[PDB]
């Protein structure tokens, strides 16, 4: 009928997440649940509480993301899985590349994030 | 190391070993209803997947993993995320991103979802 639902939901989710991320990361708790997991630069965080503290604690003042590419697929358990590739610009730091992954689940008529993995692309020096 | 990391690590080892050696044998780690997104293009089902992979235009390929992250999901699956480099034949080294969703079926771990993307300079 045109665009599959996972494409629609994934895309809108991604957009909403970065907007929140780029304007007020303290509001990020809304997209996670207690059983959510976050791996940020190789470090794992379990649970909404620990996740939000971590993200709230980043030393950036101004952050801006840019998506180069996003891919979405439905999973067998009816979840939505997405892979994002893009660039980040924080404060006066140099532009960095990153990759992000999200696993979405519909809970209570709502799509929430149960798994989030983020890793920066390092410059080969 | 946590259980999920042990499984993820092995799977990837398995995957790239096959990829780099006998890619026509990759079917072994997929299921009939597997899904592959390769550079933005979708390949649905084992048969489509295998053809696609077997058909890549190079003869020799080699991968190297720069970083690998693994997580367990609430529904018993495992998500494996990798960043790396590869060299195919005589082409220059290219950066890449790959992600896998692993499921335990019939007592073994298989890949149900696979997403691959080359990095841009």
Swiss-Prot record, chain A:
GO molecular function, one term: small GTPase binding
Pfam family for this entry, one: NTF2
Places the protein is found: Cytoplasm, Cytosol; Nucleus outer membrane; Nucleus, Nuclear pore complex; Nucleus inner membrane
Keyword field: Acetylation, Cytoplasm, Membrane, mRNA transport, Nuclear pore complex, Nucleus, Protein transport, Translocation, Transport
Effect upon mutating residue 63 to A: No effect on homodimerization. Decreased interaction with GDP-bound RAN. Loss of interaction with nucleoporins and localization to the nuclear pore complex
Effect of substituting residue 22 to A/N: No effect on interaction with GDP-bound RAN. Increases GDP-bound RAN nuclear import. Increased interaction with nucleoporins and localization to the nuclear pore complex
Name recorded for this polypeptide: Nuclear transport factor 2
Organism expressing this protein natively: Rattus norvegicus
């Amino acid at each position: 009928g045109d665009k599959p639902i996972w494409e629609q939901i994934g895309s809108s989710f991604i957009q909403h997440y970065y907007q929140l991320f780029d304007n007020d990361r303290t509001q990020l708790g809304a997209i996670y649940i207690d059983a959510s997991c976050l791996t940020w630069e190789g470090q794992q965080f379990q649970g909404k509480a620990a996740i939000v503290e971590k993200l709230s604690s980043l030393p950036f003042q101004k952050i801006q993301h840019s998506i180069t590419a996003q891919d979405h697929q439905p999973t067998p358990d009816s979840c939505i899985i997405s892979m994002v590739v893009g660039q980040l610009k924080a404060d006066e730091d140099p532009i960095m590349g990153f990759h992000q992954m999200f696993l979405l689940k519909n809970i209570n008529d709502a799509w929430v994030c149960t798994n989030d993995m983020f890793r920066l692309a390092l410059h080969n020096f």
